Chains A and B, each alone.
Chain A
Amino acid sequence: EVQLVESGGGLVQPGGSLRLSCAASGFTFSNYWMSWVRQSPEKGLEWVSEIRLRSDNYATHYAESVKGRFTISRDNSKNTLYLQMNSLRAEDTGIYYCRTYFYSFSYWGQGTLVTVSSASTKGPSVFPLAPSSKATSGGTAALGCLVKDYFPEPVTVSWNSGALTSGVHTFPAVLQSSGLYSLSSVVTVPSSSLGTQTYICNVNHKPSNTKVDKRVEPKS
């Protein structure tokens, strides 16, 4: 099975630097062209660079937007691809996908997120969304977790250590009036189960290595 595992992403200050890596496995790395593509909500998909074979004198190409600032390189002995990013700009922010070119099309990794911001990481407090009388329609209750003021993305939420999945809605983060992220996660359950089943949201914010488990209990 073909795998491409990006690493090295994360939060960096404007004008600083970062080196991504891509650990390839499951094919003969040195036989294939390799590339980097990036993604943002604001510009879409943007090709970044490409490097070819040893027999091509390891020819490189770059989108104009990064030429002179980024360097693609490959270590055929370690099956690893690299992107060295210097003089980073706010506009370099996004998801960076490693890719391998199988002769007529690319296969893509799952990408790593690069945040170019003057902010320091910030881990969120977590508050309950208390199921209450009235706010619960026809035998079905709703309860949730509110994850306020964190930076950067992402945060993840599971319920009861992943044993509660059915009826879970975890919303996209919103960027607040402050430069910070907020996200809510909610779940619908049987009203009758509110006294007998305990409900806990498991919140993880890896950029700050915050890990919170918050009991949500009906108001009293």
Chain B
Amino acid sequence: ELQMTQSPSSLSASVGDRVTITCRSSQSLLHTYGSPYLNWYLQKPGQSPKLLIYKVSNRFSGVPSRFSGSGSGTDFTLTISSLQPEDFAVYFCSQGTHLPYTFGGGTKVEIKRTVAAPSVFIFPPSDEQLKSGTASVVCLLNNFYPREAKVQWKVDNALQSGNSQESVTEQDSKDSTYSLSSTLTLSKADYEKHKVYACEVTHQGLSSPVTKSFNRGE
């Protein structure tokens, strides 16, 4: 099959940067069915892919002028000559002329922005959920950057290990920040047992780690 190798797998660039994404095949793949006519796509999360370039170097109708493709023989590049904030997306090549068709593994493009410290909020489990026998504790990290963040759960000052799950939004289309949920789940019993519930946050934008806490029972 005619498989392309897409690189890099991810990158962060600032608004205004030149960005370059490459798809490559082998000196063998090229003898088998020639220099092919790759198309380039982008995809926003939850949306269908959108055409940027067809036949290597033809910008597609409506596509903004900063996008361009070129490439010769084995090596094909998609170029963004001045990255804009709406340009975060997964970009990929498509080899749609030689059966079997294949796609590049894609390049996750993140917008780089100034450091932003999360704000932090904690929620105790509802009355309704305790009736049912589980207790979810939720810590929220809102509108921060970079993505990398440490959330530590402490129950009666005891660090918890393997009972936490995080979810993280995609980069925000409005301010390029991330928000993050961490959910500590415990039996109704484990919860009635202890009393102080805390999550401790550590991020590059915080001089010192921020702790939000509550005691069970108002």
Contact = CB atoms under 8 A, between A and B. Distances in A.
- Across chains A and B, which 5 residue pairs bring their CB atoms closest together, nearest first? A171-B167, A45-B103, A47-B101, A142-B121, A127-B126
A173 B123 contact: no
Contact of B165 (A45, A140, A176): A176
Contact of A104 (B54, B99, B126): B54
Given A105-B51, A134-B214, A184 B183 contact: yes
A126 B62 CA distance: 43
B150 to A, nearest CB: 18
A133 B168 CA distance: 25
B122 interface: yes
B167 A47 contact: no
21 contacts: A44-B103, A44-B106, A45-B106, A47-B103, A104-B55, A105-B39, A107-B51, A125-B129, A127-B125, A129-B138, A134-B212, A134-B214, A144-B138, A148-B129, A169-B142, A170-B169, A171-B169, A174-B167, A174-B183, A182-B165, A186-B181
Contact of A171 (B105, B122, B168, B212): B168
Interface residues of B, number: 47
Interface residues of A, number: 47
A130 B48 contact: no
Nearest to A127: B126
Interface of A: 44-47, 50, 61, 63-64, 97, 101, 104-111, 125, 127-130, 132, 134-138, 140, 142, 144, 146, 148, 169-174, 176, 182-184, 186, 188, 219
Contact of A132 (B102, B123, B166): B123
A130 B123 contact: yes
A47 B94 CA distance: 10
A130 B126 contact: yes
A173 B103 contact: no
Contact of B121 (A109, A137, A174): A137
Interface of B: 37, 39, 47-49, 51, 54-55, 60, 92, 94, 96, 99-103, 105-106, 119-126, 128-129, 132, 134, 136, 138, 140, 142, 165-169, 179, 181, 183, 185, 212, 214, 218
Contact of B168 (A44, A135, A172): A172
Given A106-B94, A135-B214, A169-B169, 16 more contacts: A44-B103, A45-B106, A47-B96, A47-B103, A105-B60, A125-B128, A127-B126, A129-B123, A130-B124, A137-B120, A137-B121, A142-B142, A146-B136, A184-B138, A184-B167, A219-B218
Contacts of A97: 48
Contact of A135 (B60, B92, B121): B121
B27 to A, nearest CB: 24
Nearest to A146: B136
Given A47-B100, A110-B48, A182-B183, A142 B167 contact: no
Given A105-B60, A105-B96, A44 B105 contact: yes
A217 B106 CA distance: 44
Contact of B181 (A132, A137, A171): A171
A135 B120 CA distance: 7
Contacts of B128: 125, 127-128
Contact of B100 (A64, A134, A176, A188): A64
Main secondary structure of the interface of A (DSSP, over half): strand
B140 to A, nearest CB: 6
Contacts of A137: 119-121
A140 B120 CA distance: 11
B105 A144 contact: no
B199 to A, nearest CB: 10
Nearest to B210: A137
A132 B123 CA distance: 8
A109, A129, A182, most chain B CB atoms within 10 A = A129
Contacts of B99: 61
